[PDB]
C-alpha cells in the first residue's frame, strides 16, 4: 500500500483525474451498448467496497 | 444585420441601440423560432465584446440556463452553440479544471456528432477554444496538433475584416 500524503513541497498536481474517465463499446445480441471503461486487470485490483 | 454591420466597424454602442428594437419586433410577430436566432446573436456579440455584458437586459448566464433546456428536438445546432458559451464563461470564471473539461467535452461531442464540415464556423471555434484550453494547461504538444486545423484569414462574421491581418501581425 502506497501512502502519498499531501506535501507543500510537492506541486506535482494531477490532471488525469480532472479529465473525464473513458468508456467502452461492447455490443450484445440485441444492440450495441455503452459501459464505463474498466482496466482488464482492474476487476481484481479495483478499490474494494470492503 | 445592421447590428452586425455596426459591430463590424467597432461602433458597438450604436449597435446596442440597433439590437434592442429587434427584441420588441420579435415579440409582436409572436413567433418562437426567431427568438432562438435573436438570443444566439446576443452572446456571439458579447463573445467579441465581453465588456458589454452588463449593458444587456439579459445576463449571459440566463441564456445558457434557458438554451440548455430549450427542447429535445428541432434544435440541431443550438445545443452546440449553447455549450461553447458555457465553456468560454467557465474558463473566464477560472472554474475548476474538472468542470471546464466536462463542459468542453459536451460541446466537442455534440459538434463532431453532426456534420462538422458544413458547420465550418463552429468547428473553427472548437479549435480555437481547445487550442487555448490546452495551451493554458501548458501542453503545447496537444495544442500543436489542433492548431494545424485552425484556419487563418478566415476570421468570423461581425468582427471587422482586417482583424485577421492584425492578429497575424501581433504574433
From Swiss-Prot, chain A:
Domain of life: Eukaryota
UniProt-annotated location(s): Cytoplasm; Nucleus
Functional summary from the UniProt entry: Component of the anaphase promoting complex/cyclosome (APC/C), a cell cycle-regulated E3 ubiquitin-protein ligase complex that controls progression through mitosis and the G1 phase of the cell cycle. The APC/C is thought to confer substrate specificity and, in the presence of ubiquitin-conjugating E2 enzymes, it catalyzes the formation of protein-ubiquitin conjugates that are subsequently degraded by the 26S proteasome.
Subunit structure: The APC/C is composed of at least 13 subunits that stay tightly associated throughout the cell cycle: APC1, APC2, APC4, APC5, APC9, APC11, CDC16, CDC23, CDC26, CDC27, DOC1, MND2 and SWM1.
Miscellaneous comment as given in the Swiss-Prot or TrEMBL entry: Present with 1332 molecules/cell in log phase SD medium.
Full protein name: Anaphase-promoting complex subunit 4
Residues of the full protein shown: 102 to 151 of 652
Swiss-Prot record, chain B:
Localization of this protein: Nucleus
Subunit structure as annotated in this protein's UniProt entry: The APC/C is composed of at least 13 subunits that stay tightly associated throughout the cell cycle: APC1, APC2, APC4, APC5, APC9, APC11, CDC16, CDC23, CDC26, CDC27, DOC1, MND2 and SWM1. APC5 directly interacts with MND2 and SWM1.
Miscellaneous field: Present with 259 molecules/cell in log phase SD medium.
Function in brief: Component of the anaphase promoting complex/cyclosome (APC/C), a cell cycle-regulated E3 ubiquitin-protein ligase complex that controls progression through mitosis and the G1 phase of the cell cycle. The APC/C is thought to confer substrate specificity and, in the presence of ubiquitin-conjugating E2 enzymes, it catalyzes the formation of protein-ubiquitin conjugates that are subsequently degraded by the 26S proteasome.
Record family assignment: Belongs to the APC5 family.
Protein name listed in UniProt: Anaphase-promoting complex subunit 5
Source organism per UniProt: Saccharomyces cerevisiae (strain ATCC 204508 / S288c)
Lineage of the organism: Eukaryota, Fungi, Dikarya, Ascomycota, Saccharomycotina
Span of the entire protein shown here: 344 to 514 of 685
